[PDB]
Design a protein around this ligand. Structure first.
Ligand code: ATP
Ligand code: ATP
Ligand code: ATP
Lengths: 568, 568
């Protein structure tokens, strides 16, 4: 005999539409058994749950069993496999036999791709035989049903493509338990927090927004982490209290952790009352920093510390960018009301990497959105079929994690091979690209930014609205801007600040023919030269004559570094 | 019923940070049970302890149990396995059932890779079933918990790669019990010596200091080795005594070991009184020399006697190296104040056998930091999913014992498999490597040095600053160095040594454009020419005229060999 378990039904949320459908399909046959028998009409047999790992498939099934109050028979992937070639099949029979005999019940097949994979991919005579056993069992249920047998077979899988097309046909109902979005994460957070006394400064909405690739289990842990962090105050109190009851002078201490441990060991039968404290928003942020995501090894690319303050001038461009990208992301309400469709893509042309990197990253950071950077010819192969498949993969990855900015650096290679007939490989890639661009735009969230140092030879087809229609021209040469950049870089140091020196450096001819990346390099070069001076002087004095170290940087260091460094 | 044991908590030391973390996670749920029940918040369930064998994992667990005063349930690797196919599973259930019933308790799973290894590596139907039983038990605990059930599951393993990824996910907290310290070894030595009568000249502190990568088991053996060494005096005494009782003249001897054996055999029923002697410091040093752990594949690697005085010239390279490695280790204050992130790695490229290994050791030695050397194909295994986990392990070990220099010799194997699509295994490994490199930059202490005799096909991604960005070019063209090499090779011969000849040979133009391998070949070539002279002369004289053979080598042989041989 196998009775049901006690799991919390108030734990799962964000699955409103799907749970409703499940309820409709499962409630009538299980709960009103007498009614279905009298009518003579047939019902739903198999319910397949799919989606990514940790999506709450196992929990949903467990919850449903507990809530209805029916008998739960858990069939895990390797639980039926035995030692001898026959015991496995015998067990499958017994499972189905006992199940049909006792009703109402819920049979749950957790991780089904391990038992019933494609019969062409399995060259073993045991695996094919097991699939056959399942099929036979399914038929037996169908025949017995009009008497008073009420059993529903639930199943969970992570990938539908790995399953045998034959079993797919047998199963009738399918529920998609998809990716936890911003809204979904918010809901999950609320479910977990339900039993906790939250403070007024805590905004679960803010937490959800700044939580990219976290799953239901991860969020569960973030909540637990916050709990431990809050109870550090009580630990400090106990330490002070212990050192007063049992002093032990300085004999109990060799280090800090060991002394704390020893005091607690001495106490033993001492019971203490713990005050119920509230958690802060700061504690949650601390907890979030210490937690790890799931999709971290893929094409994620983290957003740098680049803001608008790092970009000198280009105020007109800044405003235009805000309108296009920040407008639809932050204000969807505004766009729906007026009547226009959100953006798809923009194109940047002019100076190089320095200008492009500062633009691409600044906009991306500000929106607090994801960023992916694919640079020029670092995609092409000698073979005929991986290049196109790779491009498809990039867009799929981008689609999965929205909001995201997809950045294409140096497009002068791929695009001009259309106007004149030359290569076949280049033709295929560009055509796939055009195709991918047109496809996305209705659902949005994915904004494509293209950049090139050369605007002349480009195909007009790519330029067309809906693809990369917004052509933004970028230019960097101006003195006032350079001074601002120098100040911004030298702002992040921590006495001697020296403003006059910064202005003079900017005035020089060599500085005029520079870029953002060049100025950064100049700063680093000056720092290195200064270190050389400090090292040579200090070592000479210490050995011949221990003194203090001086991290101060003067003009002589800047001048020498300036003389050597060249642009691009 | 199973009550706690009485083990000394003052025995384990050197684990300050780790013990503190363990305290935080284990103290609150076990000690203040009433408080956690009232609040309704959830806590930590599983704590996994990893690291090498004899690191004190079993002792730490035992100590923690005794110190807190909770019930200790020891579950060893083969303690739950029975005779029939069902008794094993029944026992696992009973363990979890009794454990949840009685609280507060600590369940300790010692050596878990024997019970729950990878389910793909286990083709048995019993092993997979046992893993399933553990999973089911884990879930049962989680459900029961809000009532008043307080049980923490501790576990110890020697290798994280062998564990099933499924159980890894179930366990939440992980503690790394890495490299044993100087203080810790001192303590272990004292524990073992406890029953022995040590002399006054023995300083256990000195032993511990000069014992780098030895574990608890190794130290145990060093003590045993000392015992055998002392009892050699008694052996000599018995030998002399035996040769007096039963002389047997010279009939009992053909060799030395055999005669000794024969005498003892004759005696049989002769009982002798053994005097209790004290061990010396000299005997311990002798014992230490004969002991060897080797640790891992390469394991621990002590720093050689290589300084800057062993390297001829390359003064520019020396200064650059000092800046990068010695700069951040010795002067962290300087780097934080200026504003730049510490080094992560450098690359050494040039001609075959120029002394790349020697330069690497010199830098490491000078910083008085640790050194690990992993050479080319001495990394690859037969397994697939273990390669990536092994790389992760290396970085974890390096992180634990910082400051350390991680040296990769002959990188020509791993790096070129990016520019052209080879396979999937190579792709995963290199991507994991890039990931590991990016992570280490702010935390630092671990500086990665790469060396290769071939620079052509390498991915630019690895070359980027922050990874192996600093490309240092090395060569070998100095006269003084060549003389030293010639002397070193001609040192291993055994009359006529001749120093003047060696210097002149080095001076020649043909010698200037050479390498270490070339000089070795020249020496061999000269030896061959000399043999020809000896053979022709000896045969002519013996036949026409048996005389003696002359192994002497003059300058004429060297000159002829020198004329013919060409470089590479
Ligand atoms: N949608 C969700 N809402 C609340 N909690 C969740 C959700 N999804 C997962 N969790 C938490 O994560 C845990 C894992 O859930 P579960 O094992 O059901 O996921 P899964 O999709 O079945 O994973 P797998 O299929 O790989 O076993 C649950 O115990 C739950 O605490
Ligand atoms: N860190 C340490 N401090 C003091 N003594 C130690 C330490 N580590 C080991 N020892 C000594 O060595 C013995 C072995 O310890 P223990 O069995 O806990 O190591 P282990 O890591 O659990 O080994 P394994 O996991 O292979 O069983 C202990 O009884 C102790 O006397
Ligand atoms: N197997 C060895 N490992 C390290 N040092 C060696 C070895 N054999 C000789 N040496 C030392 O190095 C000098 C010889 O240099 P060699 O031509 O072997 O180049 P190397 O870089 O030291 O060795 P390798 O090229 O094998 O790394 C000698 O002075 C000798 O003392």
């Amino acid at each position: 005999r196998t009775p049901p378990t006690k799991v919390s039904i108030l734990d799962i949320a964000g699955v409103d539409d799907t749970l409703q459908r499940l309820l409709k399909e499962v409630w009538f046959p299980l709960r009103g058994g007498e009614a279905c028998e009298k009518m003579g009409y047939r019902y739903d047999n198999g319910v397949l749950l799919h989606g990514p790992s940790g999506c709450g498939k196992t929990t949903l099934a467990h919850a449903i069993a507990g809530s209805i109050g029916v008998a739960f028979i858990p069939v895990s992937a390797p639980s039926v496999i035995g030692g001898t070639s026959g015991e496995s099949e015998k067990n499958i029979r017994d499972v189905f036999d006992e199940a049909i005999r006792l009703a109402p019940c819920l049979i749950f097949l957790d991780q089904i791709d391990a038992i019933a994979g494609r019969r062409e991919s399995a060259n073993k005579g045991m695996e094919s035989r097991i699939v056959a056993e399942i099929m036979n069992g399914m038929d037996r249920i169908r025949q017995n049903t009009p008497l008073g047998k009420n059993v529903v077979v639930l199943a969970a899988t992570n990938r539908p493509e790995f399953l045998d097309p034959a079993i797919r046909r047998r199963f009738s109902v399918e529920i998609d338990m998809g990716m936890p979005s911003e809204r979904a994460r918010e809901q999950i957070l609320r479910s977990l927090t339900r039993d906790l006394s939250l403070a007024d400064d805590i905004n679960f909405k803010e937490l959800a927004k700044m939580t990219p690739g976290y799953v239901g289990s991860d969020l569960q842990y973030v909540v637990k982490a916050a709990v431990s962090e809050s109870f550090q105050a009580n630990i400090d109190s106990l330490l002070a209290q212990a050192r007063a009851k049992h002093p032990a002078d300085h004999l109990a201490n060799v280090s800090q952790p060991q002394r704390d441990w020893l005091l607690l060991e001495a106490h033993r039968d001492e019971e203490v009352s713990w005050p119920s404290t509230k958690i802060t928003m700061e504690q949650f942020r601390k907890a979030v920093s210490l937690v790890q995501p799931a999709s971290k090894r893929e094409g994620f690319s983290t957003i740098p510390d680049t803001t608008w303050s790092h970009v000198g001038a280009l105020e007109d461009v800044r405003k235009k960018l805000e309108m296009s990208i920040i407008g639809p992301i932050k204000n969807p309400e505004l766009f729906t009301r007026v009547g226009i469709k959100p953006a798809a893509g923009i194109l940047l042309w002019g100076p190089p990497g320095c200008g492009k990197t500062l633009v691409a990253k600044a906009v991306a950071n500000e929106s607090k959105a994801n960023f992916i950077s694919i640079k020029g010819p670092e995609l092409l192969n000698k073979y005929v079929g991986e290049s196109e498949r790779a491009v498809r993969q990039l867009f799929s990855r981008a689609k999965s994690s929205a909001p995201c900015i997809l950045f294409f650096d140096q497009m002068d290679a791929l695009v001009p091979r259309r106007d004149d007939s030359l290569s076949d490989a280049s033709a295929r890639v560009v055509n796939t690209l055009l195709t991918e661009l047109d496809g996305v735009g209705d659902r949005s969230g994915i904004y494509v930014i293209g950049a090139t140092n050369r605007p002349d030879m480009i195909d007009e087809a790519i330029r067309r609205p809906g693809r990369l229609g917004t052509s933004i021209y970028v230019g960097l040469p101006s003195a006032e801007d350079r001074v601002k950049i120098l100040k911004t870089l030298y702002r992040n140091t921590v006495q001697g600040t020296t403003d006059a020196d910064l202005e003079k450096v900017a005035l020089d001819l060599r500085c005029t023919g520079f870029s953002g990346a060049d100025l950064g390099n100049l700063m680093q070069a000056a720092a290195q030269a200064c270190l050389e001076r400090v090292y040579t002087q200090r070592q000479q004095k210490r050995k011949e004559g221990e003194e203090e170290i001086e991290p101060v940087i003067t003009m002589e260091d800047w001048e020498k570094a300036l003389n050597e460094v060249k642009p691009s």
